[PDB]
C-alpha cells in the first residue's frame, strides 16, 4: 500500500527551484493545467519530462564549455549538453538533459572556470544565459546546445572543459517553458490535469534569488510536489489501484484536520476551492494517505 | 522491516555539499573517524549534529543580515542566523543552524540584496566568508552570529533584510570541523565509529567548485550516507532490532554482488578491506537490506 | 548576425498620433534593452526612450514625458512608440536601437535601426 514520507513541507525541498519549501496555496487566478517539466512523477514511480531524482539536479545542466571572446558581446560560452552524472546527452522523448530549467528568463548561472592569466587560476564564473522566449539566443537544449555570455573589456582566457551550471539568479522570470529547440517542437510531459469542476491544484511554492526593481514582490515559483515526495514515489515500486489517494493534511500537534485532498495518480493534487482569489496553508502540517478513491471522489470544500 | 530506497548512488544528493553523489569509495589513508556534523542520522530516523532533512539546507545559512562598509576592509556582513525555514535558531544540544557547513576554508557564499546606489535595485551579492580555522573572524553560529567581507573601493549601500546564503566556492578547503563557538565547547555528533579489525568507512564523495592553483585536483568532500538515505531514515519510523545491517550492492540489471558492507545502526557503512590505498566501486548499482547482524558479524573482504 | 528593423514613419498633423514599431532578429547572447533615438536636421542625435528587456523599467527624455509611450512585452524582439499630442519640433528620423543590459540605459547602445522619418506639420 501507498504511504509519503512524513515531513512537514516547510522542510522538504522545491522541485522546480532549488531552495526551502516555503508557501503552500491554491490559487485560481493561476493558470489551471500548467506544463512543468520538472516535479512531475507518478505514484507509480515513472518519472516525466525532465525530472531528477535528486534535488541538486533541479534547474541545472552540465556540459562541455568553450570559450571565445568576441568584441562588442563579451565572453561567449558554448555548452554542449550531458546528463548531470556525466552520461552522454541523446536527443530523445523528453524537452531536454534531466533538471534542466522548465521556466523563461535570465538565469545567471555559475561555473568552475580555469583561466592562464595572472591570480585566480581555477575559480567561479558568473555567465547570463536565456532560457526565454524565442527570439532571443536560438537554444536548443533539446539538441544539446546553449549559449551564454557575459561583458568583458577583454579574453578572459578561459580553458575548454567540462561544467555543472547551477543558479545564481533569475531576470525577466516567467513560469512558461523555455526555448528547447530553437522554437521548433519537442517531446514533452502533457498540462497537469485534468480537476473535476470545483477542483484547482495545490501548489508548494518557493522564492527565487532575484534581478528586480526596488518594490518587487519575492519572486514566485510553483511546483506539485515536493522533491523528497518525487524521489520516494520514483524510489518505491508502489500499486497503482485507481484514479487517486484520499490525502489529509492534519496540525502535528493538535490532530486537527486542515483540509482533504486527492493526490491522482499522474502526480497532481486537487482541492476543492470555490473563492476566485489565493488561500494560503500552514507549511507545518503531515500529508496522510486515508484511501484509494475514485476519479469522481467528491472532495470536501475547503 | 528496515528497507532501502531504490536509488543508485550517482543519481542520489550528496549530504554535506550540495551537488550529486560522484563518486564510492574506500580509503584507508584518510581520517578513519570524522566527526562530521552533516549527513549524521540513526536507522531509526534520529537525527544527529546539524544535518537536515532536506538537501537544500545543506552547507547553507539564513540571516537577518547587516551591512556597513569599513574603509581598508570593504564590506562587512553581520549575519544574525535563523533556521532555513524561517523559525528562530535557538541555542540548543547541535553546534549551529541545521544544515551550516561542517567543513573549514573559506566559503564564497550568495545573498540576495537590496541597493540604493543606482544600476539593478535588487540583486545578488557575493561574499567571503570563513568557517575556519580558528585566528580568522571569531565566528560563533552557535550563539547565532557569523561574519563575512569582500573588497569594495567605496559602501555597497546593501540595505538591512534577510538573507539565505547559498555556496559558491570553497578556498583552502580542509575536512575538519569549522569554528562553530569563537573558541568554546558545543555538542558534537560522536566521531563515526567503531570499526571492527579490518573493517573501514564507506565514502560517498562529490566534488567542489572552488579557487585553487592552476593544477589542483577537484576538491573530494565525502559523506557516511547520500542525503536521500538520510531522508530516508528520518521520514521512516523503523524499529532497530540489532547493532547492524548487512546490506549487498548488486548490479542493477543483472544482481551481480560487488561488495557487502554492514549499516552500523548509529548511520555509518563498513566494509572489510586490507589494502593501505584508495579502492573505487561502480556508482550505477543499488544497496538492498539482507538482514540484522550483530556487532561483531564478520564480512567477506573485497 | 543582429539587426533592427523599424516602420511607421509618416507626415501628421500638430496634435496627431503616430505609432513606430522596431523589431529584433538574428541570435543575442543575453538580455538586451530597446530603445528609441532622434536626429533633426542639422542638430545632434538624441535620446527619447528604453525599455529593460523584462519590459518593468522604462526611461523617458524630459521632452515626451506624457506625451510618448515605449511598449514592449517580457523577452520580446518588438518595441513600439505610441507617439501622441505631436508637435512640429519632434520631426526628425527616429532610429531603432538595441544594447547589452538589465536596465533601459540612456547611452552606449551597439546596434542601431535604419531609421524613419517622421515629420510633424504645424
Known amino acids: 500500500m501507498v504511504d509519503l514520507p512524513v515531513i512537514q513541507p516547510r522542510l522538504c525541498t522545491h522541485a522546480r527551484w532549488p531552495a526551502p519549501v516555503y508557501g503552500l496555496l491554491v490559487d485560481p487566478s493561476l493558470p489551471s493545467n500548467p506544463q512543468w517539466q520538472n516535479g512531475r512523477v507518478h505514484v507509480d514511480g515513472t518519472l516525466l519530462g525532465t525530472t531528477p531524482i535528486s534535488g541538486s539536479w533541479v534547474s541545472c545542466f552540465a556540459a562541455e564549455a568553450a570559450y571565445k571572446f568576441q568584441s562588442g558581446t563579451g565572453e561567449v560560452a558554448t555548452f554542449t549538453l550531458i546528463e548531470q552524472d556525466g552520461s552522454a546527452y541523446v536527443p530523445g522523448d523528453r524537452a531536454a538533459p534531466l533538471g534542466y530549467p522548465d521556466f523563461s528568463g535570465q538565469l545567471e548561472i555559475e561555473v568552475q572556470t580555469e583561466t592562464t592569466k595572472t591570480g585566480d587560476k581555477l575559480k567561479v564564473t558568473t555567465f547570463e544565459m536565456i532560457l526565454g522566449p524565442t527570439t532571443n539566443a536560438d537554444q536548443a537544449p533539446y539538441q544539446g546546445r546553449v549559449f551564454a555570455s557575459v561583458t568583458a573589456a577583454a579574453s578572459l582566457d578561459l580553458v575548454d572543459g567540462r561544467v555543472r551550471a547551477v543558479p545564481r539568479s533569475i531576470y525577466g522570470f516567467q513560469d512558461t517553458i523555455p526555448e528547447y529547440n530553437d522554437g521548433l517542437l519537442v517531446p514533452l510531459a502533457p498540462p497537469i490535469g485534468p480537476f473535476l469542476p470545483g477542483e484547482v491544484l495545490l501548489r508548494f511554492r518557493t522564492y527565487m534569488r532575484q534581478i528586480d526593481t526596488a518594490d518587487a514582490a519575492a519572486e514566485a515559483i510553483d511546483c506539485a510536489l515536493p522533491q523528497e515526495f518525487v524521489s520516494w514515489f520514483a524510489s518505491n515500486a508502489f500499486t497503482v489501484q485507481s484514479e487517486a489517494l484520499l490525502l489529509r493534511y492534519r496540525n502535528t500537534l493538535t490532530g486537527q484536520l486542515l483540509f482533504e485532498c486527492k493526490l491522482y495518480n499522474e502526480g497532481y493534487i486537487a482541492l476543492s476551492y470555490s473563492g476566485s482569489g489565493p488561500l494560503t496553508f500552514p507549511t507545518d502540517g503531515i500529508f496522510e494517505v486515508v484511501s484509494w478513491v475514485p476519479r469522481l471522489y467528491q472532495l470536501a470544500s475547503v | 522491516m528496515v528497507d532501502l530506497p531504490v536509488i543508485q548512488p550517482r543519481l542520489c544528493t550528496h549530504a554535506r555539499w550540495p551537488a550529486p553523489v560522484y563518486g564510492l569509495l574506500v580509503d584507508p589513508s584518510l581520517p578513519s573517524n570524522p566527526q562530521w556534523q552533516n549527513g549524521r542520522v540513526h536507522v531509526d530516523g534520529t537525527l544527529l549534529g546539524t544535518t537536515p532533512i532536506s538537501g537544500s539546507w545543506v552547507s547553507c545559512f539564513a540571516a537577518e543580515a547587516a551591512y556597513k562598509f569599513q574603509s581598508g576592509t570593504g564590506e562587512v556582513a553581520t549575519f544574525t542566523l535563523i533556521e532555513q525555514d524561517g523559525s528562530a535558531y535557538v541555542p540548543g544540544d547541535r553546534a549551529a543552524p541545521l544544515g551550516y557547513p561542517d567543513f573549514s576554508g573559506q566559503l564564497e557564499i550568495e545573498v540576495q540584496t537590496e541597493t540604493t546606489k543606482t544600476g539593478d535595485k535588487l540583486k545578488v551579492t557575493t561574499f567571503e566568508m570563513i568557517l575556519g580555522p580558528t585566528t580568522n573572524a571569531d565566528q560563533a553560529p552557535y550563539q547565532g552570529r557569523v561574519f563575512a567581507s569582500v573588497t569594495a573601493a567605496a559602501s555597497l549601500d546593501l540595505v538591512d533584510g534577510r538573507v539565505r546564503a547559498v555556496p559558491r566556492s570553497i578556498y583552502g578547503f580542509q575536512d575538519t570541523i569549522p569554528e562553530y563557538n569563537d573558541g568554546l565547547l558545543v555538542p558534537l555528533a560522536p566521531p563515526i565509529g567503531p570499526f571492527l579489525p579490518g573493517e573501514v568507512l564507506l565514502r560517498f564523495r562529490t566534488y567542489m567548485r572552488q579557487i585553487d592553483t592552476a593544477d589542483a585536483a577537484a576538491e573530494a568532500i565525502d559523506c557516511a550516507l547520500p542525503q536521500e538515505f538520510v531522508s530516508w531514515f528520518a521520514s521512516n519510523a523503523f524499529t532497530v532490532q540489532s547493532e547492524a545491517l548487512l546490506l549487498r550492492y548488486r548490479n542493477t540489471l543483472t544482481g551481480q554482488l560487488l561488495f557487502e558492507c554492514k549499516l552500523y545502526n548509529e548511520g555509518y557503512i563498513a566494509l572489510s578491506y586490507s589494502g593501505s590505498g584508495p579502492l573505487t566501486f561502480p556508482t550505477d548499482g543499488i544497496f538492498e537490506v539482507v538482514s540484522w547482524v550483530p556487532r561483531l558479524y564478520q564480512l567477506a573482504s573485497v | 548576425q543582429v539587426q533592427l528593423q523599424e516602420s511607421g514613419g509618416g507626415l501628421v498633423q500638430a496634435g496627431g498620433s503616430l505609432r513606430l514599431s522596431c523589431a529584433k532578429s538574428g541570435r543575442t547572447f543575453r538580455a538586451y534593452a530597446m530603445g528609441w533615438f532622434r536626429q533633426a536636421p542639422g542638430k545632434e542625435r538624441e535620446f527619447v526612450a528604453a525599455?529593460?528587456?523584462?519590459?518593468?523599467?522604462?526611461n523617458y527624455a524630459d521632452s515626451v514625458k506624457g506625451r510618448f509611450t515605449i511598449l514592449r512585452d517580457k523577452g520580446m524582439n518588438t518595441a513600439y512608440l505610441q507617439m501622441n499630442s505631436l508637435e512640429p519640433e519632434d520631426t526628425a528620423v527616429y532610429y531603432c536601437?538595441?544594447?547589452?543590459?538589465?536596465?533601459?540605459?540612456?547611452?552606449?547602445?551597439?546596434?542601431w535601426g535604419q531609421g524613419t522619418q517622421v515629420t510633424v506639420s504645424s
Open positions: 536601437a538595441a544594447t547589452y543590459s538589465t536596465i533601459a540605459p540612456r547611452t552606449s547602445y551597439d546596434f
Open positions: 525599455i529593460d528587456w523584462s519590459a518593468a523599467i522604462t
